């Protein structure tokens with residue numbers, strides 16, 4: 286059995302550099318998960334991106350998973366009026382993380398916009414089984430997680446209302462997080478209610494010297510980075526990670542679904558020869574070498590659509606095991622072997638729904654203290670129970686108390 290599973294994930298494509306990263310992965314059979322921003326398809330993302338559509342097609346045609354990172358990386362919150370030059374304008378100030386989330390309803394809606402743009406540029410995108418745009422997301426800047434009803438985390442220092450973490454006077458108060466962080470938490474919850482899972486990361490393959498003129502050249506070496514992975518294994522890395530704005534607060538250390546897994550965050554723009562350094566000439570070899578020695582160290586590589594295992598006929602499940610089935614998270618009621626006619630569902634006796642959503646949902650094991658939303662109103666669970674269709678919170682006064 287493997288030492289563990291690494292989920293190599295790439296943020297902020299599709300850009301020209303994505304093609305070179307993908308090719309490297311393909312020559313070793315490794316599949317990645319790509320958290321894409323469609324504004325690069327529109328040509329306003331201030332990267333080398335004339336081949337962005339080519340790169341999206343290549344990701345899909347060679348089996349990589351495409352996921353939702355929002356249309357424009359929240360850059361509308363970086364400028365007064367979003368437009369074709371906002372990306373460069375925000376790159377000039379480096380203020381990406383300041384007021385990064387403002388109106389959570391609007392900001393969450395830019396994940397929906399992202400999908401509309403993908404489906405205009407690639408009309409058959411939903412005929413690809415590896416297109417997970419509607420089901421997997423990651424918030425810009427934010428190591429926040431929405432995995433199951435009992436597996437969630439928020440980056441409480443991820444973004445700021447004024448000061449960047451290194452400026453004099455910067456403070457993060459975990460009991461009074463920034464307005465930006467509070468808005469981002471609401472974004473997480475909106476997406477969970479639309480059926481997304483969101484995944485953060487354990488380790489960020491990033492420049493070791495943010496300060497040199499060509500920072501991409503300081504990308505950690507393959508051997509040293511494997512050391513970071515090894516150290517992340519089963520050590521609750523999302524909470525121990527540095528810098529402060531990268532921590533995932535509340536992450537349930539030791540949760541079984543994270544056991545023996547390491548989610549790596551990196552960015553394809555770090556693997557390009559250009560304004561950030563000779564990332565292609567120096568860093569693509571580090572990537573290729575990482576894949577080789579990771580596999581030799583006993584690791585296997587997988588994509589985020591398998592982080593929660595997909596339900597499969599014939600597999601053995603223990604009580605408490607989590608799966609996804611047709612995109613929905615379920616928790617096994619009893620140990621059993623899966624059979625084709627008894628799949629998870631809203632009426633299954635073998636599974637309960639354990640999506641990280643907070644809207645009232647059928648076949649959920651509700652506990653005292655849970656709060657559900659139903660017909661626009663909030664209800665507290667009074668009596669633990671498994672929900673069912675007749676027990677809608679507005680009419681079930683024994684089981685729910687309106688807030």
Ligand code: NA
Pocket residue numbers: 420480481482612613614
């Ligand atoms: Na889902």
Ligand SMILES: [Zn+2]
Pocket residue numbers: 296297354358424425426
């Ligand atoms: Zn990003």
